[PDB]
């Protein structure tokens, strides 16, 4: 059955990136997920919240 | 052939005495003046823990007893 | 077997008497790690009991 | 022990870099020397990518061989002169020594076999505590969940409330190590009454954590009840000058400042490990609360009022709320034409419904998945 699966996989592809991924092949997961997104915002905001208000100080 | 019946009665008390579960909200209250002819098997941490004494009053107590009676 | 008064089957356990006596005594089941200030003794005890048993060949 | 601090400083070195090549690294190395550690030196070098002095490694390994030799020998003498409670102890020094040598599998096995002995409670329990300790040290997870269950049983049977408190400190700190702050709230927050477990960290650190998580996941009247009015905090929360300043700023409706201290502490979290990348989850949330708390008394209020309060420009403020509104995490809605904001209250059902369906789906996906497996 495993062999059959493998065969199927082979047919579907090879593959280029898939091979690389396999080669690379860890870690955990923690608990739950979504949505990460970007970062360096909060302080950036404050950096701007200053600047903003500093601009508003400039105002 | 009379003792046999009692002993068990003790063992009965004994068995269901500690057989509970720690959760069984059931307290045991035993009253006796001659706190002496009591198999120690009774007064063991678990079956009979708190041991309480009832003095023959004195001065103060009597005042409460007297005042309460009168 | 009730009326046949032959063994129908052999039930499990018997209950032991010595165990029953021990239960009736109820003497705290105490593990070491709970008595500080009683080593020298313990050592002695070990010497007079533990060692004597562990390796009576000693 | 093994002393966590090694791990914390290690993580510190990992940081976004930051290099540096400051206190940290040489602090670590300094505690390699006196700790003749090894499994790091290759583990760390392979991680950080900066090895050197093949000689030092050899010296450390040598001395290690010396003492492992010695403890092995000691144990040998016991086998002929046991000494039940003794043997297990020399073992505790063995696997323990693996802790000083910070090798996981080794102390693991060593401890295990010591359980077959142990017999008592402090050895069969507290030893476990250390075994998991390693867990905290490596940054694992399961390795702990399975042992906190063990100790859980050992404590559920008998034991006392002295071990249960450390226990709740570990479990708690763990809960923080994930996104599970709610569970850490009560756990840690209740850990202030007692805290003999300085093994991990000090008392004021812990304090900052329990106050942090408290502020995060406690309600407003139970914040005032269990933290703002913390007899053990007042004497400590006066010892600090950051989280507290924020906590008060909230509770008392002094927003605009609250923000600044919030950013500050955020810039203090990314340094820790218990949060690591949670510094992004914490602040996100702490943004919402205030926005929430600000509106709750208004059926309508004007942006410039808010922006003015917090002391930011409108456009940025609008931009912020836009994050939380569509997610139904905030019951506001905005009108930009007139610069106004009105608040639509939510229905209880609407809350659960969204939560119930989410939970039900998670169970369904797991049910089916493993269904097919057992089906074939």
Q: How far apart are CA D374 and CA C47, in angstroms?
A: 58
**Scanning every residue of chain D, which has its alpha carbon at the shortest distance from the alpha carbon of C56?**
D81
Q: How far apart are CA D205 and CA D180, in angstroms?
A: 19
Distance CA D266, CA D251 (A): 19
Chain D partners within 8 Å of A55 (Cβ): 313
CB atoms within 10 A of CB D128: 21
Q: What is the DSSP letter of D329?
A: S
What is the separation of C-alpha D265 from the centre of its chain, rounded to a whole number of angstroms?
16
Of the partner residues D141, D267, D283, the one whose CB lies closest to the CB of residue A28: D141
Q: Which residue has the tokens 């693991």?
A: D108
CA–CA dist D246, D251 (Å, integer): 9
Say whether D82 and C54 touch across the interface (CB within 8 A): yes
CB D206 within 8 A of CB D194: no
Distances (CA, A) of B45 to B34, B50, C36: 20, 9, 21
DSSP state of B56: -
Closest residue in B to C24 (Cα) is B41
Contact D277, D177 (CB under 8 A): no
Whether the CB-CB separation of B28 and B48 falls below 8 Å is answered with yes
| Sign of the four-CA dihedral D292, D297, D300, D301 | negative
What are phi and psi for residue D17, nearest 5 degrees?
Answer: 70, 140
- Cβ of C26 within 8 Å of Cβ of B11? The answer is no
- Contacts with C26 from chain B: Cβ below 8 Å: 18, 41, 44-47
- Quick check: D266 and A42 in contact, CB under 8 A? yes
Which uninterrupted H or E stretch holds D341?
strand D340-343
DSSP helix/strand/coil, B25: coil
- Taking CA D220 as the corner, what is the angle to CA D214 and CA D224, rounded to the nearest 5 degrees? 75
Q: Which helix (H) or strand (E) holds D301?
A: strand D300-302
Q: Phi-psi category of B7—alpha, beta or left, where left has phi over 0 and alpha has psi -120 to 50? A: alpha
Angle at A28 between CA A20 and CA D365, to 5 degrees: 90
Three-state DSSP class for residue A33: coil
Residues D129/D164, Cβ–Cβ less than 8 Å: no
| CB spacing of A53 vs D312 below 8 angstroms | yes
Helix D182-189 with D203-217: angle, nearest 10 deg: 130
Q: By the CB < 8 Å criterion, does C47 face chain D?
A: no
Chain C residues with CB under 8 Å of B46 CB are 26
Q: Do D266 and A43 touch (CB under 8 A)?
A: yes
Q: Do chains D and C touch (3 or more CB pairs under 8 A)?
A: yes
- Partner residues linked to D335 by β-bridges: D340
The answer to whether the Cβ–Cβ distance between C51 and D84 falls below 8 Å is no
Please indicate whether, in this complex, the C-beta atoms of D180 and A28 are within 8 angstroms of each other.
no
Pairwise CA distance, residues D30 & D32, whole Å? 5
Q: Which chains lie within 8 Å of chain C at 3 or more CB pairs, if any?
A: B, D
Q: Are B41 and C24 in contact (CB under 8 A)?
A: yes
Residue where the block lists tokens 């009692």: B6
Interface contact D263-A31, CB threshold 8 A? no
Neighbours of chain A (3+ CB pairs under 8 A): D
Q: What is the DSSP string of D80-141?
A: TS--HHHHHHHHHHHHHHHHHTT-HHHHHHHHHHHHHHH-SSIIIIIHHHHHHHHHHHHT-S
Question: Which residue of D80, D81, D121 is in closest CB contact with C33?
Answer: D121
Distance CA D293, CA D296 (A): 5
Contacts of A57 in chain D (CB under 8 A): none
- When CB atoms are compared, the residue of C31, C51, C55 closest to D119 is C31
| 3-class DSSP assignment, residue D174 | helix
Distance CA C42, CA D88 (A): 17
- 3-state class (DSSP) for residue D296: coil
| 3-state DSSP assignment of residue D325 | helix
Q: How far separated are the first and last CA of chain A, in Å rounded?
A: 72
SS3 D45: helix
Q: At what angle do helices D142-157 and D163-177 cross, to 10 degrees?
A: 160
Chain D residue with CA closest to C58: the answer is D81
Experimentally, how was this structure solved? Answer: cryo-EM
Name residue, tokens 């030893």: D127
Q: Kindly state the tokens that stand for D37.
A: 């550690």
Residues in D touching A31 (Cβ below 8 Å) = 178-180
Burial A10-26 (b: 16+ CB within 10 A, else e): eeeeeeeeeeeeeeeee
Residues in B touching C28 (Cβ below 8 Å): 45
Relative to beta strand D332-335, strand D340-343 is antiparallel
**Cβ contact, residue pair D120, C31, below 8 Å:** yes
DSSP string, D214-262: HHHHS-HHHHIIIIIT-HHHHHHHTT-SSHHHHHHHHHTT-HHHHHHHH
CB atoms within 10 A of CB D295: 19
What SS3 class is residue A1?
A: coil
């Amino acid at each position: 059955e495993k062999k059959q699966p493998v065969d199927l996989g082979l047919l579907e592809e090879d593959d280029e990136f898939e091979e690389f991924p396999a080669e690379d092949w860890d870690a955990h997961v923690w608990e739950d997920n979504w949505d990460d997104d970007n970062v360096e915002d909060d302080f950036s905001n404050q950096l701007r919240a200053e600047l903003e208000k500093h601009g508003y100080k400039m105002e | 052939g009379a003792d046999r019946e009692v002993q068990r009665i003790l063992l009965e008390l004994l068995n269901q005495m500690d057989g509970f579960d720690q959760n069984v909200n059931v307290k045991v209250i035993m009253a006796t003046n001659r706190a002496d002819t009591l198999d120690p098997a009774l007064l063991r941490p678990g079956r009979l823990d708190r041991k309480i004494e009832f003095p023959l009053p004195d001065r103060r107590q009597k005042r409460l007893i007297f005042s309460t009676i009168t | 077997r009730n009326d046949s008064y032959t063994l129908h089957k052999i039930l499990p356990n018997k209950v032991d008497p010595l165990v029953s006596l021990m239960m009736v005594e109820k003497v705290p089941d105490s593990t070491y790690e709970m008595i500080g200030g009683l080593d020298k003794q313990i050592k002695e005890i070990k010497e007079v009991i533990e060692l004597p048993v562990k390796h009576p060949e000693l | 022990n093994p002393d966590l601090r090694i791990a914390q400083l290690r993580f510190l070195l990992s940081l976004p870099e930051h290099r540096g090549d400051a206190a940290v690294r040489d602090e670590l190395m300094a505690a390699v020397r006196d700790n003749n550690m090894a499994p790091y030196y290759e583990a760390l070098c392979k991680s950080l990518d900066w090895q050197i002095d093949v000689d030092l490694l050899n010296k450390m390994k040598k001395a290690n061989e010396d003492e492992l030799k010695r403890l092995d020998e000691e144990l040998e003498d016991a086998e002929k002169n046991l000494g039940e409670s003794e043997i297990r102890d020399a073992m505790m020094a063995k696997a323990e020594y693996l802790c000083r040598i910070g090798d996981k599998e080794g102390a693991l096995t060593a401890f295990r076999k010591t359980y077959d002995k142990t017999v008592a409670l402090g050895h069969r329990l507290d030893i476990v505590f250390y075994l998991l300790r390693i867990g905290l040290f490596y940054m694992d997870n399961d390795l702990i969940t399975r042992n906190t269950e063990k100790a859980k049983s050992l404590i559920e049977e008998g034991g006392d409330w002295d071990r249960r408190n450390r226990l709740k400190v570990y479990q708690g700190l763990y809960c923080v190590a994930i996104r599970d702050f709610k569970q850490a709230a009560e756990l840690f927050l209740d850990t202030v009454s007692t805290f003999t477990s300085y093994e991990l960290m000090d008392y004021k650190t812990f304090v900052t954590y329990t106050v942090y998580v408290s502020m995060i996941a406690l309600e407003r009247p139970d914040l005032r009840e269990k933290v703002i009015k913390g007899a053990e905090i007042l004497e400590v929360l006066h010892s600090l000058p950051a989280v507290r300043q924020y906590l008060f700023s909230l509770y008392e409706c002094r927003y605009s400042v609250f923000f600044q201290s919030l950013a500050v502490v955020e810039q203090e979290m990314k340094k820790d490990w218990l949060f690591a990348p949670h510094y992004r989850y914490y602040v996100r949330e702490m943004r919402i609360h205030a926005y929430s708390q600000l509106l709750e008394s208004y059926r309508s209020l004007t942006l410039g009022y808010m922006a003015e309060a917090f002391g930011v420009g409108v456009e940025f403020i609008d931009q912020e709320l836009s994050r939380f509104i569509a997610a139904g995490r905030l019951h506001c809605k905005i009108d930009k034409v007139n610069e106004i904001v009105e608040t639509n209250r939510p229905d209880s059902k609407n809350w659960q419904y969204q939560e119930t369906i989410k939970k039900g789906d998670l169970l369904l996906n797991r049910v089916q998945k493993l269904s097919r497996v057992i089906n074939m």
